[PDB]
Amino acid sequence: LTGTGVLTESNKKFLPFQQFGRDIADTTDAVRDPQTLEILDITPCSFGGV
Amino acid sequence: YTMSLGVENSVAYSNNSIAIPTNFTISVTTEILPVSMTKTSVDCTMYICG
Ligand SMILES: *[C@@H]1O[C@H](CO)[C@@H](O)[C@H](O)[C@H]1NC(C)=O
Ligand SMILES: *[C@@H]1O[C@H](CO)[C@@H](O)[C@H](O)[C@H]1NC(C)=O
Numbered sequence: 224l225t226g227t228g229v230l231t232e233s234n235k236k237f238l239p240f241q242q243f244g245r246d247i248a249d250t251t252d253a254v255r256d257p258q259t260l261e262i263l264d265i266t267p268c269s270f271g272g273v
Numbered sequence: 274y275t276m277s278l279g280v281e282n283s284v285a286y287s288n289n290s291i292a293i294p295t296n297f298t299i300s301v302t303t304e305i306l307p308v309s310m311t312k313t314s315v316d317c318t319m320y321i322c323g
Contacts, residue, residue, distance in 0.1 A: 270316070270319070272314060272316070
């Protein structure tokens with residue numbers, strides 16, 4: 224699961240087998256770290272029209 | 274069922290009969306109109322190429 228974003232700890236409680244989390248419109252918004260099983264939120268790196 | 278357009282009313286017309294209202298009701302009627310969309314803008318490079 225390659226991507227670019229800001230990673231933080233999160234209040235999400237994945238079931239033991241679940242590895243990734245998705246928003247309403249398929250976009251990935253969380254992941255489980257594979258070496259210590261914390262659930263990380265993903266949000267896009269900040270952007271906007273100049 | 275075949276739908277009904279409204280109740281029938283044979284108006285009491287004759288060449289020398291008039292109906293005049295003896296009282297009134299002030300009616301307050303709500304009318305609702307759209308005026309503006311949500312203002313979208315899209316970075317078409319970030320949408321297409323990620
Ligand atoms: C991964 O290895 C480290 C060092 O041995 C250990 O602290 C950690 O608990 C291990 N995690 C898993 C999910 O096995
Ligand atoms: C007119 O209508 C009101 C209620 O809307 C009623 O109280 C009043 O007595 C009526 N007046 C007449 C002259 O019928």
